């Protein structure tokens, strides 16, 4: 049997989760825009991602306490009582809308964050992730529509007085057939597609992000290697070849040179089609000292130009953690009430002749399961503290 | 306009000698470099030879090493060939072309404007 | 030294259809191959510069695209004046310059 234990438990670990989702969400926001180095494309979706938390635990949390407290909703006994028990599911379900379209978004950000890596950007929050937001927001709201309506507070008896209680209850064909699949529409949209096209993406990213490296590793090696044959050769022949190897490398690498350092590569072909043009006149010497001259060329330009790259490429991962790190708590947290919900429906036998027991624990594994939902909306702020490496000196200061 | 224009055609003996000239109209020979192209009757395109004049630089093909040369002149802006030793397999449609030079577009445009073309047929 | 290779050594299509021709690199070479054209008793003329790239005045229905050392032209439409031999040339540098055996276009029937 339950006992008024876990009711007490309940209150107050909701009122704990208020405390703690308040003002975390509170401080993230003054960060996001205070700070002048701080405001790019990922950040304003992590910011919108706390705003829609921050409304959630600001409106629907005191309410939920009182329920929890009394046994009633607030204001049963008059008109207005009516208008605050469609909000609830309206703010709790566009919540969660919010969150899952923002992360897949910011997964699709990630994913282009490294497919030319060669094109750069500018600086503050760009043209097209503003409207982005903006649509998020507003397919959100518009997708959670059917749930306000037909929430209706219906009639019931108690200790021979008449109060209300509110429920879903059937109005029309449409909304009735809702009632019955409403059950799957959860699981198979705000579970099923992002977990599905995060993954799926993530793969893409690191697939990509891999063969370039490969690709800029063999250019740079290829000219190493090269150059050292060139060192110690001894025909016209190898050398030759060996400056074709360099001229083709050369070109490669220029391709995937965004637009300094073109400058550099330029100098690099002709400094070797000059040494091309004496091996093909028939001298060897004059060869080795024009390949000598390109040690200068490639100490002073291409090797920057590689340790830029390899540590930019470095920094666009991290972010890549970040989004996906953000994107796992959050299947972790959701994961279990929407398992409870689909076993109890479908695993559950009435003829059973031990399911009273088994629902004894399944129902108080449901009153956890519910919780570590609530839990995540106050989970996003200490996550980004330990993860981004970049928000602590902003904690900090 | 630019144009290319070519002469010194006609029949020749075996181990004969042979003068063919490459005229240019509508640009300066020293920003481009000159190549020479063959064709044999009823076969593929082959490379011949190739000169530039801001240089000086001239190179050949292995099977025509030694027996032609090349020359530019950049006062009545044009180019020479003269063949020398000439065998059977020599008789083709021989084709003038223009390349640019390195540090910009023009490399990547390969040849652009291509001659008329001159028969060449030696016989005995 | 650098060999280059043409598969197909004619085509049998007609007015509407699509061809392909793909040309092979034995060495290396970068983006730098083009492409020509030539009809029977004139000089060729080029179409397809760095493996993608179309020249001043030829039809947009001549493409072209690379894959390491595969290079792939394609014709959308085959209207009659396409109707010649094709040739896929690289040129890496001055002296190193080799050209393809030629593939021939001609009516079905």
């Known amino acids: 049997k339950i006992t008024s234990a876990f009711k007490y438990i309940n209150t107050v670990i909701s009122c704990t989760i208020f405390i703690v989702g308040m003002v975390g969400n509170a401080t993230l926001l003054r960060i996001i825009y205070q700070n002048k180095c701080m405001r790019n494309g990922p950040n304003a979706l992590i910011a919108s991602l706390a705003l829609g938390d921050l409304i959630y635990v600001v409106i629907d949390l005191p309410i939920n306490v009182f329920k929890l407290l009394a046994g009633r909703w607030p204001f049963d006994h008059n008109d207005f009582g009516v208008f605050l028990c469609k909000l609830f599911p309206f703010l709790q379900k566009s919540s969660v809308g919010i969150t899952v379209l923002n992360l897949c978004a910011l997964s699709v950000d990630r994913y282009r964050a490294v497919a030319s890596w060669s094109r750069v950007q500018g600086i503050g929050i760009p043209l097209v992730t503003a409207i982005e937001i903006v649509s998020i927001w507003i397919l959100s709201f518009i997708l959670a529509i059917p749930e306000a309506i037909g929430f209706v507070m219906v009639p019931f008896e108690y200790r021979g007085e008449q109060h209300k209680t509110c429920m879903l209850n059937a109005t029309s064909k449409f909304m009735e057939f809702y009632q019955d699949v409403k059950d799957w529409w959860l699981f198979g949209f705000y579970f099923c597609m992002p977990l599905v096209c995060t993954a799926i993406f993530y793969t893409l990213m690191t697939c990509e992000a891999r063969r370039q490296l490969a690709d800029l590793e063999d250019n740079w090696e290829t000219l190493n290697d090269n150059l050292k044959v060139i060192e110690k050769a001894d025909n016209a022949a190898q050398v030759k070849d060996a400056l074709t190897k360099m001229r083709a490398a050369a070109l490669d690498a220029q391709k995937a040179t965004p637009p300094d350092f073109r400058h550099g590569f330029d100098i690099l072909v002709g400094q070797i089609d000059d040494a091309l043009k004496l091996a093909n006149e028939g001298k060897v010497k004059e060869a080795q000292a024009a390949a000598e001259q390109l040690k200068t060329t490639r100490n002073a330009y291409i090797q920057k130009y590689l340790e830029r790259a390899r540590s930019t490429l470095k920094q666009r991962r991290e972010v890549a953690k970040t989004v996906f790190c953000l994107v796992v708590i959050f299947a972790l947290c959701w994961f279990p009430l929407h398992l409870s919900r689909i076993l109890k429906k479908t695993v559950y036998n009435e003829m059973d002749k031990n399911r009273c027991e088994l629902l004894s624990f399944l129902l108080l594994m449901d009153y956890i399961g519910i919780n570590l939902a609530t839990m995540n909306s106050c989970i996003n702020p200490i996550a980004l503290y330990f993860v981004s490496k970049k928000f602590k000196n902003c904690f900090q200061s | 306009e630019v144009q290319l224009v070519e002469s010194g055609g006609g029949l020749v003996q075996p181990g004969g000698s042979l003068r063919l000239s490459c005229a240019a109209s509508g640009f300066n020979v020293v920003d481009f470099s000159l190549h020479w192209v063959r064709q044999a009757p009823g076969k593929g395109l082959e490379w011949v030879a190739y000169?530039?004049?801001?240089?000086?630089?001239?190179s050949y093909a292995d099977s025509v090493k030694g027996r032609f040369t090349i020359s530019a002149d950049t006062s009545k802006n044009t180019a020479y060939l003269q063949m020398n030793s000439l065998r059977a397999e020599d008789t083709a449609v021989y084709y003038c072309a223009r390349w640019g030079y390195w540090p910009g577009e023009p490399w990547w445009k390969a040849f652009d404007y291509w001659g008329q073309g001159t028969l060449v047929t030696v016989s005995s | 030294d650098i060999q280059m290779t043409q598969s197909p050594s004619s085509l049998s299509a007609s007015v509407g259809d699509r061809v392909t021709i793909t040309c092979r690199a034995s060495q290396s070479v970068s983006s730098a191959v083009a492409w020509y054209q030539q009809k029977p008793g004139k000089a060729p003329k080029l179409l397809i510069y760095?493996?993608?790239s179309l020249y001043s005045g030829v039809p947009s229905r001549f493409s072209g695209s690379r894959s390491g050392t595969d290079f792939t032209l394609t014709i959308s439409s085959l209207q009659p004046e396409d109707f010649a031999t094709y040739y896929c040339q690289q040129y890496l540098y001055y002296s190193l310059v080799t050209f393809g055996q030629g593939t021939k276009v001609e009516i079905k029937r």
């Open positions: 000169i530039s004049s801001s240089s000086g630089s001239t």
């Open positions: 760095s493996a993608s």
